[PDB]
Amino acid sequence: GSSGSSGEEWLDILGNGLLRKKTLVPGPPGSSRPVKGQVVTVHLQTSLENGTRVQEEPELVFTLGDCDVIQALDLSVPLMDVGETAMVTADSKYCYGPQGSRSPYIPPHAALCLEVTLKTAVDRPDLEMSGPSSG
């Protein structure tokens, strides 16, 4: 027969298998998934499949719904409730690309372990005296 939710292994966000998600720590019953188009602040940490931390962003902020961040992070944020620590493992393609990065630099086709943590989601900006400009 069939029980219902079949989650023996990581969760397929896209379905292919590249970009996956693993809830490390679930949030409270009061929390809930944020909205696309608001200021979401989480903690993303890039690390080589081996264990070579490439970067560490404690206060990562971006505008959900604008792909202003990694394709494995912006596609996971809206897949986790505020206060729930979830990890994501996608191929470089979704991370930086088959071409690599600049600074920090990263090798192509080189998967990277990223740990997403939804802290708070609001409309108001977090980083004062900061923002994009025309030029």
Side-chain angles (χ1 to χ4, degrees), residues 11-14 19-23 32-36 40 62 64 71-82 84-88 116 118:
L11 156 154
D12 292 326
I13 296 164
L14 300 158
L19 172 75
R20 279 158 153 192
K21 201 181 76 87
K22 173 178 80 196
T23 296
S32 205
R33 305 273 162 73
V35 46
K36 183 166 287 269
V40 270
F62 69 71
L64 186 63
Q71 272 188 291
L73 154 71
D74 208 79
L75 293 42
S76 75
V77 153
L79 319 190
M80 47 197 300
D81 306 288
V82 39
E84 158 188 90
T85 305
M87 174 167 273
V88 305
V116 192
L118 210 293

Tab-separated table of all heavy atoms in Angstrom, residues 11-14 19-23 32-36 40 62 64 71-82 84-88 116 118:
chain	number	residue	atom	x	y	z
A	11	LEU	N	15.417	15.954	-0.052
A	11	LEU	CA	14.228	16.355	-0.797
A	11	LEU	C	14.609	16.983	-2.134
A	11	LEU	O	15.455	17.875	-2.193
A	11	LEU	CB	13.396	17.343	0.024
A	11	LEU	CG	12.470	18.264	-0.771
A	11	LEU	CD1	11.300	18.715	0.088
A	11	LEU	CD2	13.241	19.465	-1.300
A	12	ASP	N	13.978	16.513	-3.204
A	12	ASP	CA	14.248	17.030	-4.540
A	12	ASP	C	13.450	18.304	-4.801
A	12	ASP	O	12.252	18.251	-5.077
A	12	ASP	CB	13.910	15.977	-5.596
A	12	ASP	CG	14.849	14.787	-5.549
A	12	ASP	OD1	16.041	14.984	-5.232
A	12	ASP	OD2	14.392	13.660	-5.828
A	13	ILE	N	14.123	19.446	-4.711
A	13	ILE	CA	13.477	20.733	-4.938
A	13	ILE	C	13.056	20.887	-6.395
A	13	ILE	O	11.931	21.296	-6.687
A	13	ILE	CB	14.403	21.903	-4.556
A	13	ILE	CG1	14.698	21.880	-3.055
A	13	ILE	CG2	13.775	23.228	-4.959
A	13	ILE	CD1	15.876	22.743	-2.657
A	14	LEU	N	13.964	20.556	-7.306
A	14	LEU	CA	13.686	20.655	-8.735
A	14	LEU	C	13.148	19.336	-9.278
A	14	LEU	O	12.371	19.314	-10.231
A	14	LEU	CB	14.952	21.055	-9.494
A	14	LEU	CG	15.581	22.390	-9.094
A	14	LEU	CD1	17.050	22.427	-9.485
A	14	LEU	CD2	14.827	23.548	-9.734
A	19	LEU	N	19.823	19.990	-7.157
A	19	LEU	CA	19.504	20.821	-6.002
A	19	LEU	C	18.642	20.056	-5.003
A	19	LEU	O	17.492	19.723	-5.287
A	19	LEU	CB	18.781	22.093	-6.448
A	19	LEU	CG	18.214	22.969	-5.330
A	19	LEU	CD1	19.330	23.730	-4.630
A	19	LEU	CD2	17.175	23.933	-5.883
A	20	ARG	N	19.206	19.783	-3.830
A	20	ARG	CA	18.488	19.058	-2.788
A	20	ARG	C	18.379	19.898	-1.519
A	20	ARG	O	19.009	20.948	-1.400
A	20	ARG	CB	19.193	17.736	-2.479
A	20	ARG	CG	18.861	16.625	-3.460
A	20	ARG	CD	19.929	15.542	-3.458
A	20	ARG	NE	19.394	14.244	-3.858
A	20	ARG	CZ	20.054	13.100	-3.714
A	20	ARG	NH1	21.268	13.094	-3.180
A	20	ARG	NH2	19.500	11.959	-4.102
A	21	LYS	N	17.573	19.429	-0.573
A	21	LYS	CA	17.380	20.134	0.688
A	21	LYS	C	17.294	19.153	1.854
A	21	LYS	O	16.705	18.079	1.731
A	21	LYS	CB	16.110	20.986	0.630
A	21	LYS	CG	16.085	22.111	1.651
A	21	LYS	CD	14.799	22.915	1.564
A	21	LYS	CE	13.631	22.165	2.186
A	21	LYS	NZ	13.534	22.407	3.652
A	22	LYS	N	17.884	19.530	2.983
A	22	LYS	CA	17.871	18.686	4.172
A	22	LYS	C	17.619	19.515	5.426
A	22	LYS	O	18.502	20.233	5.897
A	22	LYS	CB	19.198	17.935	4.302
A	22	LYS	CG	19.337	17.168	5.606
A	22	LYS	CD	20.644	16.394	5.662
A	22	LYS	CE	21.809	17.295	6.042
A	22	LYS	NZ	23.122	16.663	5.735
A	23	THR	N	16.408	19.413	5.965
A	23	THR	CA	16.040	20.154	7.165
A	23	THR	C	16.849	19.686	8.369
A	23	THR	O	16.608	18.607	8.912
A	23	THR	CB	14.540	20.004	7.480
A	23	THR	OG1	13.759	20.578	6.425
A	23	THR	CG2	14.194	20.678	8.799
A	32	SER	N	6.327	30.262	9.883
A	32	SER	CA	5.751	29.936	8.583
A	32	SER	C	6.653	30.417	7.452
A	32	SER	O	7.563	31.219	7.667
A	32	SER	CB	4.363	30.562	8.446
A	32	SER	OG	3.563	29.838	7.526
A	33	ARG	N	6.396	29.923	6.246
A	33	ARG	CA	7.185	30.301	5.080
A	33	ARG	C	6.987	31.776	4.745
A	33	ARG	O	5.875	32.303	4.782
A	33	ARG	CB	6.800	29.438	3.876
A	33	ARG	CG	6.902	27.945	4.140
A	33	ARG	CD	8.306	27.426	3.872
A	33	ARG	NE	8.537	26.124	4.493
A	33	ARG	CZ	8.000	24.993	4.050
A	33	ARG	NH1	7.206	25.003	2.988
A	33	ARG	NH2	8.257	23.848	4.669
A	34	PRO	N	8.091	32.461	4.410
A	34	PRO	CA	8.065	33.884	4.062
A	34	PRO	C	7.381	34.142	2.725
A	34	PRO	O	6.766	33.245	2.147
A	34	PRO	CB	9.548	34.258	3.987
A	34	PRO	CG	10.244	32.979	3.670
A	34	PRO	CD	9.449	31.896	4.345
A	35	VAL	N	7.492	35.372	2.235
A	35	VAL	CA	6.886	35.748	0.964
A	35	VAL	C	7.948	36.143	-0.056
A	35	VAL	O	9.035	36.594	0.305
A	35	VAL	CB	5.897	36.915	1.136
A	35	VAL	CG1	6.509	38.012	1.995
A	35	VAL	CG2	5.475	37.462	-0.219
A	36	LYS	N	7.626	35.970	-1.335
A	36	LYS	CA	8.551	36.309	-2.409
A	36	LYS	C	8.449	37.789	-2.766
A	36	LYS	O	7.424	38.248	-3.266
A	36	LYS	CB	8.265	35.455	-3.645
A	36	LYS	CG	9.240	35.689	-4.786
A	36	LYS	CD	9.136	34.601	-5.841
A	36	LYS	CE	9.747	33.294	-5.356
A	36	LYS	NZ	11.189	33.191	-5.714
A	40	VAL	N	14.652	39.041	3.121
A	40	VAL	CA	14.886	37.842	3.918
A	40	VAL	C	16.338	37.757	4.371
A	40	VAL	O	17.260	37.825	3.556
A	40	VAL	CB	14.529	36.567	3.131
A	40	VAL	CG1	13.069	36.199	3.342
A	40	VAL	CG2	14.833	36.752	1.651
A	62	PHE	N	18.703	39.599	1.066
A	62	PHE	CA	18.369	39.673	-0.352
A	62	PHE	C	16.863	39.822	-0.548
A	62	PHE	O	16.081	39.631	0.385
A	62	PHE	CB	18.868	38.423	-1.080
A	62	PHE	CG	18.116	37.175	-0.715
A	62	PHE	CD1	16.808	36.991	-1.135
A	62	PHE	CD2	18.717	36.186	0.047
A	62	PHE	CE1	16.114	35.844	-0.800
A	62	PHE	CE2	18.028	35.038	0.385
A	62	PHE	CZ	16.725	34.865	-0.040
A	64	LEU	N	13.879	38.223	-1.965
A	64	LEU	CA	13.291	36.995	-2.485
A	64	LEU	C	12.431	37.278	-3.712
A	64	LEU	O	11.631	38.214	-3.719
A	64	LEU	CB	12.449	36.312	-1.404
A	64	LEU	CG	11.892	34.933	-1.759
A	64	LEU	CD1	13.023	33.945	-1.997
A	64	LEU	CD2	10.966	34.433	-0.660
A	71	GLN	N	21.057	30.116	-6.727
A	71	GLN	CA	19.835	29.459	-7.176
A	71	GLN	C	19.438	28.338	-6.220
A	71	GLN	O	18.306	27.856	-6.250
A	71	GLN	CB	20.021	28.898	-8.587
A	71	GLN	CG	19.702	29.900	-9.686
A	71	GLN	CD	19.704	29.271	-11.066
A	71	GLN	OE1	20.751	28.875	-11.578
A	71	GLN	NE2	18.527	29.178	-11.676
A	72	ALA	N	20.377	27.929	-5.373
A	72	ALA	CA	20.124	26.867	-4.407
A	72	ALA	C	19.704	27.441	-3.058
A	72	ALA	O	19.313	26.703	-2.153
A	72	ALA	CB	21.359	25.993	-4.249
A	73	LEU	N	19.786	28.760	-2.931
A	73	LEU	CA	19.414	29.433	-1.690
A	73	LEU	C	18.070	30.140	-1.836
A	73	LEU	O	17.199	30.022	-0.974
A	73	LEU	CB	20.493	30.442	-1.291
A	73	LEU	CG	20.027	31.618	-0.434
A	73	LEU	CD1	19.690	31.153	0.975
A	73	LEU	CD2	21.091	32.706	-0.398
A	74	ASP	N	17.910	30.872	-2.933
A	74	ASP	CA	16.670	31.595	-3.194
A	74	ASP	C	15.522	30.628	-3.463
A	74	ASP	O	14.354	30.960	-3.257
A	74	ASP	CB	16.847	32.539	-4.384
A	74	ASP	CG	15.938	33.750	-4.303
A	74	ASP	OD1	16.271	34.692	-3.553
A	74	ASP	OD2	14.895	33.756	-4.990
A	75	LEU	N	15.861	29.429	-3.926
A	75	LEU	CA	14.859	28.413	-4.224
A	75	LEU	C	14.586	27.541	-3.002
A	75	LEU	O	13.714	26.673	-3.028
A	75	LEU	CB	15.321	27.541	-5.394
A	75	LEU	CG	15.416	28.235	-6.752
A	75	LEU	CD1	16.040	29.614	-6.603
A	75	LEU	CD2	16.218	27.387	-7.729
A	76	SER	N	15.336	27.782	-1.931
A	76	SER	CA	15.176	27.019	-0.699
A	76	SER	C	14.554	27.880	0.396
A	76	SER	O	13.794	27.389	1.232
A	76	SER	CB	16.528	26.475	-0.231
A	76	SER	OG	17.319	27.503	0.339
A	77	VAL	N	14.883	29.167	0.387
A	77	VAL	CA	14.358	30.098	1.378
A	77	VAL	C	12.848	29.947	1.527
A	77	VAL	O	12.325	29.728	2.620
A	77	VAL	CB	14.683	31.557	1.006
A	77	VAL	CG1	13.640	32.501	1.585
A	77	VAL	CG2	16.077	31.930	1.486
A	78	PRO	N	12.127	30.069	0.402
A	78	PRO	CA	10.667	29.949	0.381
A	78	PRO	C	10.198	28.521	0.643
A	78	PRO	O	9.001	28.234	0.609
A	78	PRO	CB	10.296	30.380	-1.041
A	78	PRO	CG	11.513	30.098	-1.852
A	78	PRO	CD	12.684	30.332	-0.936
A	79	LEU	N	11.149	27.631	0.906
A	79	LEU	CA	10.833	26.233	1.176
A	79	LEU	C	11.141	25.875	2.626
A	79	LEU	O	11.203	24.700	2.986
A	79	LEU	CB	11.622	25.321	0.235
A	79	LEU	CG	11.730	25.788	-1.218
A	79	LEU	CD1	12.312	24.688	-2.090
A	79	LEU	CD2	10.370	26.224	-1.741
A	80	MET	N	11.333	26.896	3.455
A	80	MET	CA	11.632	26.688	4.867
A	80	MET	C	10.970	27.761	5.725
A	80	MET	O	10.992	28.944	5.385
A	80	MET	CB	13.145	26.696	5.096
A	80	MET	CG	13.857	27.853	4.415
A	80	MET	SD	15.635	27.590	4.276
A	80	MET	CE	16.091	27.435	6.002
A	81	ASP	N	10.383	27.341	6.841
A	81	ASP	CA	9.715	28.266	7.749
A	81	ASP	C	10.734	29.098	8.523
A	81	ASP	O	11.862	28.661	8.751
A	81	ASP	CB	8.818	27.500	8.722
A	81	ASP	CG	7.829	26.599	8.011
A	81	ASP	OD1	6.876	27.128	7.399
A	81	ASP	OD2	8.007	25.364	8.063
A	82	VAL	N	10.328	30.297	8.926
A	82	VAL	CA	11.205	31.190	9.674
A	82	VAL	C	11.609	30.571	11.008
A	82	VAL	O	10.771	30.344	11.879
A	82	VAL	CB	10.531	32.550	9.935
A	82	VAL	CG1	9.056	32.362	10.260
A	82	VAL	CG2	11.242	33.291	11.057
A	84	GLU	N	13.770	27.783	10.981
A	84	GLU	CA	14.120	26.397	10.688
A	84	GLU	C	15.410	26.321	9.877
A	84	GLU	O	15.516	26.911	8.802
A	84	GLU	CB	12.984	25.711	9.927
A	84	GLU	CG	13.431	24.495	9.134
A	84	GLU	CD	12.336	23.949	8.237
A	84	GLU	OE1	12.244	24.397	7.074
A	84	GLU	OE2	11.573	23.074	8.697
A	85	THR	N	16.389	25.590	10.401
A	85	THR	CA	17.672	25.438	9.727
A	85	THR	C	17.625	24.312	8.701
A	85	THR	O	17.453	23.145	9.054
A	85	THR	CB	18.805	25.153	10.734
A	85	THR	OG1	18.832	26.170	11.741
A	85	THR	CG2	20.151	25.092	10.029
A	86	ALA	N	17.779	24.669	7.431
A	86	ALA	CA	17.756	23.688	6.353
A	86	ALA	C	18.992	23.812	5.470
A	86	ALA	O	19.438	24.917	5.163
A	86	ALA	CB	16.492	23.847	5.520
A	87	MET	N	19.542	22.672	5.065
A	87	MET	CA	20.728	22.656	4.216
A	87	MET	C	20.350	22.420	2.758
A	87	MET	O	19.271	21.904	2.461
A	87	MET	CB	21.701	21.571	4.685
A	87	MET	CG	22.901	21.396	3.770
A	87	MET	SD	24.211	20.409	4.522
A	87	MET	CE	25.131	21.676	5.392
A	88	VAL	N	21.243	22.800	1.850
A	88	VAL	CA	21.002	22.629	0.422
A	88	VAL	C	22.276	22.212	-0.304
A	88	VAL	O	23.338	22.805	-0.110
A	88	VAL	CB	20.462	23.924	-0.215
A	88	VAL	CG1	19.213	24.396	0.513
A	88	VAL	CG2	21.531	25.005	-0.212
A	116	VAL	N	21.424	26.868	4.766
A	116	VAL	CA	20.518	28.007	4.864
A	116	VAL	C	19.791	28.017	6.203
A	116	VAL	O	19.367	26.973	6.701
A	116	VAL	CB	19.479	27.996	3.728
A	116	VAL	CG1	18.738	29.323	3.668
A	116	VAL	CG2	20.148	27.691	2.396
A	118	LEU	N	16.788	30.400	7.988
A	118	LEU	CA	15.842	31.511	7.997
A	118	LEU	C	15.695	32.091	9.399
A	118	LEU	O	15.147	31.447	10.295
A	118	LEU	CB	14.478	31.050	7.477
A	118	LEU	CG	13.634	32.112	6.773
A	118	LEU	CD1	13.201	33.187	7.757
A	118	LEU	CD2	14.406	32.725	5.614
